Design a protein around this ligand. Sequence first.
Ligand SMILES: NC(=O)C1=CN([C@@H]2O[C@H](COP(=O)(O)OP(=O)(O)OC[C@H]3O[C@@H](n4cnc5c(N)ncnc54)[C@H](OP(=O)(O)O)[C@@H]3O)[C@@H](O)[C@H]2O)C=CC1
Ligand SMILES: NC(=O)C1=CN([C@@H]2O[C@H](COP(=O)(O)OP(=O)(O)OC[C@H]3O[C@@H](n4cnc5c(N)ncnc54)[C@H](OP(=O)(O)O)[C@@H]3O)[C@@H](O)[C@H]2O)C=CC1
Ligand SMILES: Nc1nc(N)c(-c2cccc(Cl)c2)c(CCCOc2cccc(OCC(=O)O)c2)n1
Ligand SMILES: Nc1nc(N)c(-c2cccc(Cl)c2)c(CCCOc2cccc(OCC(=O)O)c2)n1
Ligand SMILES: O=c1ccn([C@H]2C[C@H](O)[C@@H](COP(=O)(O)O)O2)c(=O)[nH]1
Ligand SMILES: O=c1ccn([C@H]2C[C@H](O)[C@@H](COP(=O)(O)O)O2)c(=O)[nH]1
Lengths: 520, 533
Amino acid sequence: QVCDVFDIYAICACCKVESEVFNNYTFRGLGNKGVLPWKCISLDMKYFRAVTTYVNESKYEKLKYKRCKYLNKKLQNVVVMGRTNWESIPKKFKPLSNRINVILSRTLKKEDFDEDVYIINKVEDLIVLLGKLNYYKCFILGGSVVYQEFLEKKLIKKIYFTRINSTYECDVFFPEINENEYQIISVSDVYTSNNTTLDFIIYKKTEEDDFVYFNFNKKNSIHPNDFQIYNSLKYKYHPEYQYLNIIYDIMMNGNKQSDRTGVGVLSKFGYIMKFDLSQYFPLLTTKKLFLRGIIEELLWFIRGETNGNTLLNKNVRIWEANGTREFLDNRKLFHREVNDLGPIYGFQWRHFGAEYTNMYDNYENKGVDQLKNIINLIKNDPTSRRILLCAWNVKDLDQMALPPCHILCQFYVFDGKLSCIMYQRSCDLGLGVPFNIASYSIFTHMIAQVCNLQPAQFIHVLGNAHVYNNHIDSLKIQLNRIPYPFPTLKLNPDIKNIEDFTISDFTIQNYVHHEKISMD
Amino acid sequence: CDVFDIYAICACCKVESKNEGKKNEVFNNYTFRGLGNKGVLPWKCISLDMKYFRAVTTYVNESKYEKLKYKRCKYLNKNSKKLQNVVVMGRTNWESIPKKFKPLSNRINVILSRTLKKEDFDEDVYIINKVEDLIVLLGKLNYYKCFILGGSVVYQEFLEKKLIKKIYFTRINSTYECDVFFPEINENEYQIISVSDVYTSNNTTLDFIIYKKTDDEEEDDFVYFNFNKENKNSIHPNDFQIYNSLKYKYHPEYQYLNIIYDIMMNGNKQSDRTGVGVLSKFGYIMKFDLSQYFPLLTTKKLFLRGIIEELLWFIRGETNGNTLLNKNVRIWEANGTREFLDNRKLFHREVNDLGPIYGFQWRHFGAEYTNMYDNYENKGVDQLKNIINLIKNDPTSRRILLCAWNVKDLDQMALPPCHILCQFYVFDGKLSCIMYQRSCDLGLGVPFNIASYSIFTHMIAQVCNLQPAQFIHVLGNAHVYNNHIDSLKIQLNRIPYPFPTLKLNPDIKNIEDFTISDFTIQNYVHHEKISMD
Ligand SMILES: NC(=O)C1=CN([C@@H]2O[C@H](COP(=O)(O)OP(=O)(O)OC[C@H]3O[C@@H](n4cnc5c(N)ncnc54)[C@H](OP(=O)(O)O)[C@@H]3O)[C@@H](O)[C@H]2O)C=CC1
Ligand SMILES: NC(=O)C1=CN([C@@H]2O[C@H](COP(=O)(O)OP(=O)(O)OC[C@H]3O[C@@H](n4cnc5c(N)ncnc54)[C@H](OP(=O)(O)O)[C@@H]3O)[C@@H](O)[C@H]2O)C=CC1
Ligand SMILES: Nc1nc(N)c(-c2cccc(Cl)c2)c(CCCOc2cccc(OCC(=O)O)c2)n1
Ligand SMILES: Nc1nc(N)c(-c2cccc(Cl)c2)c(CCCOc2cccc(OCC(=O)O)c2)n1
Ligand SMILES: O=c1ccn([C@H]2C[C@H](O)[C@@H](COP(=O)(O)O)O2)c(=O)[nH]1
Ligand SMILES: O=c1ccn([C@H]2C[C@H](O)[C@@H](COP(=O)(O)O)O2)c(=O)[nH]1
């Protein structure tokens, strides 16, 4: 194949388009009025320059042989542009440096250009030219017209595709990719550049003995084909893979166990995930999540409330099952009013060590206001190793509707940035953990803002990590979905106190996600 | 040796050192030198070393033979197809081996001997009269690699004649009566380039080390995904010469050493409470397989009497610093002084009255602290009893947690606990433990802290009739003191030894019944003590 001999690749950047169901075609905006739809995304420019300029000397002779054999016979890449594309580039950036420049045109000829460029009036002439040049790889840089004809002709080996996770006015579009001709093989980390998130995906046309020696000493009824898309990917660098890889590990290596609930689980013990909150908001994209409930739940914690009715009256049902007459009696809380959850999170955060009475009592200035103390440590003693918020009050556990899953939060401050570790004793990977990542990520943003810091890392440590048997088929589906670039979280910047946030102070922007799943 | 790919593969134990150890035994690579006793192995059977042996000496890569055959002809200036390795044995060596294991299967069996000739054996089973008759035989043979399986004599003469390219060296971490020894490997002639995981087989730990004579479409994609990647801290390269010269660092001590390297290379410069300055990072996990070893650091010397007394003192629920000081355990001495308590605003606290720390929270969480002499019997929550009962009676509970971080009591403690909580996990008769540590002194504290919680995991497992599985150590604020940097540079350039084992008195069946005499560290092989400051 011509694309394999001549190593012809496409590289593009696509945004979302002004016009909700999401698919790969969501990212299709290329240009507007003969220029880019966006002002400048410097990180995509950096990636573009590195990919289109990189060559490997030592690998060239193998390519020279391949092309010689097919034809019967500093190193640079070739870059090919449409005439309209060429005319969009600033004079100061043209011809593209350290690359062989090729322009496709009928209306213009070599006499129309001052620059060191090749003009070709036919695609077939590109193939003849590549045959005559010494070069590493050939990158098609666009036009929409140019992409459309090179894909149509099956002359593209791989598409290096930037997903720009923001919406702009566009008048030219990247062609809809055919899933039977091209499949994603690699997905990068998520980044922020110029107030947008983005990632980089790759579509593909559809001493060593000592290592084996040290391997001389190498469970569950999971089938290979069950994870075909998941295991087809070469580079899984998107941070959502920290979640998906743990699910995979428990399904393949997990220990079959009963639990408190009767469903039985697969379980393992001890994991860590790390999310860079400076670069993205880690709301899972491989299924739909809504945050209104978990934001109302965090605001209720911060107020120190234990009254379940406060959440039910906001149509948030997260704690409804744990406040029922039946549930409280099964906990031996016979003298507890329905939806009186006892001295759970909010109470421990604002009043640790106070005697719990009922959900209506005024606990002002009783027990330890841990939340206030950690905000004061972050502001006045930021190098403190003692900046911890702890919900696990051993004395009060049997008075709680249930003992907390999120044991503690520890904070770390360096160079004006705030990082948070949350330790979770018990982690429902299918249902709970996706919400728990979002909760503590929002909380990190809130604590950073009220202490005049920038959020850095949310670090999630999982103790007993389990998949419920009734979630296994739903997670097999989810694991074969390719994550989308993450959204971003914005807070009202006028909020200066932890107690002053309300639901309208939080916006999730650019959330692109796969379809809702019922885990059950 | 680089033409005919000649390697030595051996297994060496420790040797009864002649009733005489100087004061404290000094250890080096030579510690492991025992080969044989009265024509047999010094040990009964170590089945994991037998399996490694079989696997190393039989493994062949057909698709790499062209480079080897080419080099052999080219250099020498010059059928069945099933490529095999050569294995060379001394006569004594050959005659130790049982019949049904001779000849060695899937391998070309050679035998250095003055007093045998081929017509007693075959052409399958080559004999050679002198060393040079091997290079001759190799010249005329299709083979992958040549493995010298020794005899003390065979190894001695092969090494002195510089014919060995690499040594596959099993360190058997136990002492046996031996009459023949492996020769002292000159560290100027050979260096270790790889170290395995530590294993238990047949009631000994062992590891495997290697001495050395002193679709690429997807390869460019790796470079593209690295397009945004980074003397950050004033630490040089040649500082970690030996550390960075190893190819495979699978020994579990590297989970500690790699964190020190990460903090030295990438850590944040910060002031602290202590006034000294640290490099710090946030969030690490180490995991130690207590079924296979006891992870007592071997790249310096550690003592355990103090940390075992401390754990027994926790289990009794004591807060009385004098109990430890009267045993010359000084871990808490500085935290109990008049000056230290007065700086904590504990003006009304008696010297060495540490307040409601670990012991008190493990046995009496929620009780009102009075003083270190009061009777707290049946006061507050006995967490230690509750977790033992949960492990025995409800082992799949996800609520098996022991927590020292009592928010109410923090300001009454001489200092808030570094070791926030232990969480337990039970599966298939085996006990694993996660300990979360808010504040981790990588140079001084963390080596002790790994030993403490590893011992505790064994204690809890034994009193619940379980086998210990993993100790999982979660580090929060993980820091290297600026005054440890030189010492840890020294330490990172030491190669770990196979780990010791911990033995508990098997009679102890209740967590309260352990005493100092119930704990034995066996086969502790360690590098020289380092003063961290
Ligand atoms: N986001 C991204 O990655 C990219 C965005 N862009 C944007 O795309 C827009 C420009 O694209 P679009 O308008 O399609 O224009 P194109 O850059 O695809 O250029 C079209 C022109 O190139 C010539 N051409 C194409 N094919 C041939 C052929 N087979 N033989 C001879 N000449 C050929 C013709 O020039 P003539 O008329 O002279 O004959 C044709 O009119 C701009 O908004 C630009 O900013 C461009 C590239 C990448
Ligand atoms: N721990 C380990 O890894 C290993 C341990 N062992 C143990 O070691 C002991 C065997 O070793 P050790 O006693 O040295 O005996 P060896 O197996 O080294 O036997 C030495 C004999 O091999 C022949 N030989 C050696 N060099 C030459 C030469 N240059 N030219 C001709 N013949 C030569 C001679 O036999 P001849 O009499 O025929 O002249 C010599 O006496 C046993 O206890 C065995 O179990 C053995 C292998 C490995
Ligand atoms: N992933 C991806 N694929 C694409 N094909 C295009 C792209 C878009 C329009 C035109 C061109 Cl040539 C390329 C872009 C947008 C980034 C364009 O960056 C450029 C283009 C040309 C010159 C240039 O020089 C200055 C510099 O290198 O800093 C930078 N992104
Ligand atoms: N790393 C290492 N190096 C060494 N050189 C020796 C060794 C020790 C004594 C004799 C011999 Cl041949 C080898 C050992 C001890 C393992 C013994 O391996 C054997 C010895 C004899 C027969 C045999 O076949 C049976 C089997 O396949 O298990 C395996 N370990
Ligand atoms: O924020 C939460 C709350 C609960 N759980 C899950 C973990 C367990 O499946 C269950 C709690 O039950 P126990 O672990 O307490 O038995 O709920 C979470 O994942 N996250
Ligand atoms: O068992 C212990 C006790 C202390 N430390 C270290 C951590 C810190 O360097 C210091 C405790 O001081 P703060 O982190 O509380 O400031 O002692 C440990 O590593 N392990």
